[PDB]
Amino acid sequence: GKISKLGRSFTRARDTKFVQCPDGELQKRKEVVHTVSLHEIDVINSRTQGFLALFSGDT
Amino acid sequence: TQRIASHSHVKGLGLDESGLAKQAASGLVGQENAREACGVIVELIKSKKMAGRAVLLAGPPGTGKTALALAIAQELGSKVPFCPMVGSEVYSTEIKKTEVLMENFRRAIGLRIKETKEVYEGEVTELTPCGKTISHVIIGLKTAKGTKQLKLDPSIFESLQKERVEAGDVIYIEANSGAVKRQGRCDTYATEFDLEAEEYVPLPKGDVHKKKEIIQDVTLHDLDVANARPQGGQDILSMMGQLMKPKKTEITDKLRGEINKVVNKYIDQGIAELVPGVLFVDEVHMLDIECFTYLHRALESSIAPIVIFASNRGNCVIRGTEDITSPHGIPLDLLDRVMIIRTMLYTPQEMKQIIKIRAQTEGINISEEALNHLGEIGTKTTLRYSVQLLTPANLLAKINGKDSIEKEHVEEISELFYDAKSSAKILADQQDKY
Amino acid sequence: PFRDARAAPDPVLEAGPVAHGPLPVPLVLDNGSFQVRAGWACPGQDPGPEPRLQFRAVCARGRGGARGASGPQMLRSPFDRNVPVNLELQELLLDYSFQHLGVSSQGCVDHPIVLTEAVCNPLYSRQMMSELLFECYGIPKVAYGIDSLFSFYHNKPKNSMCSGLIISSGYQCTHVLPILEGRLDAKNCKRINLGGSQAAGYLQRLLQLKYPGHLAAITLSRMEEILHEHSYIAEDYVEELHKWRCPDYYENNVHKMQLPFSVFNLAAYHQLFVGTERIRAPEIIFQPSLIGEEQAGIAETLQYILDRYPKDIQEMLVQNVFLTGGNTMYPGMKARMEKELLEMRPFRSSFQVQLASNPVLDAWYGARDWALNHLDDNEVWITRKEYEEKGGEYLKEHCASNIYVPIRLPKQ
Amino acid sequence: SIDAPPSFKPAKKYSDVSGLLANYTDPQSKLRFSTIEEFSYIRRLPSDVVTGYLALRKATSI
Numbered sequence A: 001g002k003i004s005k006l007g008r009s010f011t012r013a014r015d016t017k018f019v020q021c022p023d024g025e026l027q028k029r030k031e032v033v034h035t036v037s038l039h040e041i042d043v044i045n046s047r048t049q050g051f052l053a054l055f056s057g058d059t
Numbered sequence B: 001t002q003r004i005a006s007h008s009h010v011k012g013l014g015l016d017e018s019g020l021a022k023q024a025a026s027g028l029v030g031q032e033n034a035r036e037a038c039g040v041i042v043e044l045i046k047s048k049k050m051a052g053r054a055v056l057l058a059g060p061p062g063t064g065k066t067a068l069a070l071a072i073a074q075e076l077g078s079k080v081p082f083c084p085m086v087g088s089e090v091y092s093t094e095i096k097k098t099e100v101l102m103e104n105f106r107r108a109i110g111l112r113i114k115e116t117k118e119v120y121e122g123e124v125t126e127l128t129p130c131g132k133t134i135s136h137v138i139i140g141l142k143t144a145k146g147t148k149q150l151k152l153d154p155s156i157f158e159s160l161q162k163e164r165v166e167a168g169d170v171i172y173i174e175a176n177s178g179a180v181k182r183q184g185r186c187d188t189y190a191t192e193f194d195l196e197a198e199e200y201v202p203l204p205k206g207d208v209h210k211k212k213e214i215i216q217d218v219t220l221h222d223l224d225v226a227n228a229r230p231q232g233g234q235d236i237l238s239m240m241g242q243l244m245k246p247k248k249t250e251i252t253d254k255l256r257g258e259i260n261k262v263v264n265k266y267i268d269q270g271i272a273e274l275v276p277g278v279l280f281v282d283e284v285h286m287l288d289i290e291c292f293t294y295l296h297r298a299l300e301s302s303i304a305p306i307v308i309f310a311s312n313r314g315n316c317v318i319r320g321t322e323d324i325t326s327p328h329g330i331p332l333d334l335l336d337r338v339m340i341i342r343t344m345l346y347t348p349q350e351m352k353q354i355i356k357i358r359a360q361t362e363g364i365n366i367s368e369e370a371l372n373h374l375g376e377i378g379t380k381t382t383l384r385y386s387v388q389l390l391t392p393a394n395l396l397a398k399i400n401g402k403d404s405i406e407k408e409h410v411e412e413i414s415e416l417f418y419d420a421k422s423s424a425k426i427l428a429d430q431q432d433k434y
Numbered sequence C: 001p002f003r004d005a006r007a008a009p010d011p012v013l014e015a016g017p018v019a020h021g022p023l024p025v026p027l028v029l030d031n032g033s034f035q036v037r038a039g040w041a042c043p044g045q046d047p048g049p050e051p052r053l054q055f056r057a058v059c060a061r062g063r064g065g066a067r068g069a070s071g072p073q074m075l076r077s078p079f080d081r082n083v084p085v086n087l088e089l090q091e092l093l094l095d096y097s098f099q100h101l102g103v104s105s106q107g108c109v110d111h112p113i114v115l116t117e118a119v120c121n122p123l124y125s126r127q128m129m130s131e132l133l134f135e136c137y138g139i140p141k142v143a144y145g146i147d148s149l150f151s152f153y154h155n156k157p158k159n160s161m162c163s164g165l166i167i168s169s170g171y172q173c174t175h176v177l178p179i180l181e182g183r184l185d186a187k188n189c190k191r192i193n194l195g196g197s198q199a200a201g202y203l204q205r206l207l208q209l210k211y212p213g214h215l216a217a218i219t220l221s222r223m224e225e226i227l228h229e230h231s232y233i234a235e236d237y238v239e240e241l242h243k244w245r246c247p248d249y250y251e252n253n254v255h256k257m258q259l260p261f262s263v264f265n266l267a268a269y270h271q272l273f274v275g276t277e278r279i280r281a282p283e284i285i286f287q288p289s290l291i292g293e294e295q296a297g298i299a300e301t302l303q304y305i306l307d308r309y310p311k312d313i314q315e316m317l318v319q320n321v322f323l324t325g326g327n328t329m330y331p332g333m334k335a336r337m338e339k340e341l342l343e344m345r346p347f348r349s350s351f352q353v354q355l356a357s358n359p360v361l362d363a364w365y366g367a368r369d370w371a372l373n374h375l376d377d378n379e380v381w382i383t384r385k386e387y388e389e390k391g392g393e394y395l396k397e398h399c400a401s402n403i404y405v406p407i408r409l410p411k412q
Numbered sequence D: 001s002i003d004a005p006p007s008f009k010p011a012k013k014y015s016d017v018s019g020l021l022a023n024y025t026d027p028q029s030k031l032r033f034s035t036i037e038e039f040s041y042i043r044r045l046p047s048d049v050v051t052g053y054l055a056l057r058k059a060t061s062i
């Protein structure tokens, strides 16, 4: 239920950033490759919101 | 596949049934007199009778001390805890040095528990609570193998409510733990709206209900740590968990006393069994004189694990004394509490066998004429250096389009990567430039 | 490539094929909505030798006005939704059947008859079917029974008391019939307002919209061939149609239905490619929502009747699920039904699905075997004189018959 | 009183012109379709076959 907005279509740029409308079909099954350091698994597991210590350094 | 590493070829001590060693077996070669001794230690750990007994492996660098220590962990297998540590780990910034010793001594003793893991999963066909207030809740489940009904307690019902479960959702219940997981809405309802924020999953094709027998491993240290500080209780969902950062702390003596008393209750009731394991304090000469003195108490205690030590030092100064030399870098007072196993340097023929066993472990084909050359270079340098050159030699053989190591490949690599002895000769010559 | 159907056979017989023993050999008459099936009981022979008169239940009378015709040959038919509701168009259907079978001579048919009727039959309808039979044709005694239940009676392991669900699917209806101790539990029986007529009608209208260039080339009698020979029922529809989505499977499985010829001529004399259509026509009885129609369909209905019993007698009556009639002829029907049944039972429990030995003829063979046994059980039949004191809205409660209730119709 | 009950579940949405599952419906013709080529196809149909398809489902079309 997250919405991301990428601006407005060029044909209604009048009346903010502008872009052409997408190609292909509306609903795409996409596939995403993702990778995490072995450390970053360890820190997320340490605390109620462990991931903040991955920035603040309090690990 | 699994990554190859510095000891992955050793698979056990490889003794025959009489207890004597074979020349070459289970991925070790040589060292008969020194590794027959580990056989006796394995029988001692399997006997379970003793506590606090300890062993020292002694001998020069590259003579097999950690290989033998890991070979013991193979012969015991994953039933029995084996906790490795490095001497330098003692110097924490959160807790005193003897606390780190005591935690690691506890880690090497395991409770082994049995239970029947029992799982229900499928689409929720109905929820119906059952006077004044809810006595129980009936729930129905469906999969492509059939239907069941269950009778939940109000604690589980609270958990279903917290997961925001409603009829038509696909659910996993684990009956032992009281664990409850929502897995999405069942796809038969995927047309209720065109756009809605849920994720829809197909009706499960597996059994509605499954049973296993499982075995749980937990050490005494896990009981200590879990029980000492208040357990947080946050499945997140509670912002108070954000404020107080964790830290390690000196576990009090009183608490370990109670934990011992409660575990004795359960091993009388047959609910648990006990496995005394091994603590391997490697690199022992990095311990301080304070710590060496505390070991004189912990190795006497009628609860302690078997402890294995290893060291490579001659007659060096004991850390923290600024003055006193002692054999192996260990105080004489403690050295009179351990049995000592000596470890011996390899003859050229031994190194050839180790090199070939490393090659066929690491995946490399090598010709006899090249293997004789790594054998020679090992006598000039050290075994731990000849075994480094195998992979880079293979990688040049591959670049030059050939399957197998040949003399010119190892000869090229020898000119390209130096040894510590020959590099030190360069530093003695260009002395004024560094 | 399409065929054309046969017409106008030569059924002619002597005045009565009376065998040894009892002289009043009964007529066995399956009064179907799609077609009628009729013949002599022919007792003393184990295999029913000749179910004569296999013919479509449709009659011709056109702009000429002055004549009508009845055999296999604008058209009309006597039924509304599997109950007969026509006067003379029923008579001239019976007449055809009697005349081609032979009859004595005098001002009546001398032989008793067993006759199929609707799973429930409205009282007025039963009354009219009795009047149109006793008055005009003068039959001595009559029996009414249900097609499906005769087919079950035929297919039973033994001539003994039983329980089961009957799944039945004819021209314009499918029914789910729970039966207990040989009795139809008609209080909680249910039917679905769809059937093989509506499947053919849908497949027609699809192909008309697919090829508007030749509406005239496609017609019911050609829709029959693709629906009988070339269509099948999915194990799971949303998975079948998903494997039909890829072109390399499609070209290997699409059906090439060559029309007769007079550009390679297909721009009009097309090969009428049927792909997904060969699934979407059978599936109507499991998902009536492929048409406009909001009803439970053969899957939700079976669960909805089966949950209205105690959990022990469910496990009893599911031990004999039986498939019979018309639409059950599709290939794959047993597999789809037993898979759909596996999801709606207790996790380790058992069920059995039986398919009728001949799904279309077993209703008639059942009525044969029934009448040939119950010749002299005069509590079972309605005698000619009973119809003079009970007004025609009356029935005799034998097994394989609709449940009677005490009631009477005003008439003058 | 023998009629079967209405279904409880919401209806699946198959495409008109091929029968494959339809994620999509066109805002003007009100037919439903699975893929881009099917959307190209429907836009080239005359009004007669469009109302013809909708009439198979007793949709607003009368």
Ligand SMILES: Nc1ncnc2c1ncn2[C@@H]1O[C@H](COP(=O)(O)OP(=O)(O)OP(=O)(O)O)[C@@H](O)[C@H]1O
Residues within 6 Å of the ligand: B006, B007, B008, B010, B027, B028, B029, B030, B031, B060, B061, B062, B063, B064, B065, B066, B067, B068, B283, B312, B354, B383, B384
């Ligand atoms: N007898 C043997 N058989 C097979 N491989 C051996 C043998 N002895 C040593 N090795 C291998 O050679 C290397 C020797 O490491 P070794 O156990 O000697 O370390 P160490 O110098 O004794 O102690 P540390 O681990 O503290 O450096 C490893 O790759 C080991 O697996």
Ligand SMILES: Nc1ncnc2c1ncn2[C@@H]1O[C@H](COP(=O)(O)OP(=O)(O)O)[C@@H](O)[C@H]1O
Residues within 6 Å of the ligand: C031, C032, C033, C034, C035, C082, C147, C169, C170, C171, C172, C195, C196, C197, C200, C227, C228, C229, C325, C326, C327, C329, C330, C360
């Ligand atoms: N071989 C077959 N395959 C598929 N459908 C068939 C087959 N034979 C008959 N049908 C279907 O059976 C239906 C008629 O069955 P029938 O038992 O005679 O009906 P009823 O008893 O209501 O008159 C028709 O709609 C026809 O499409």
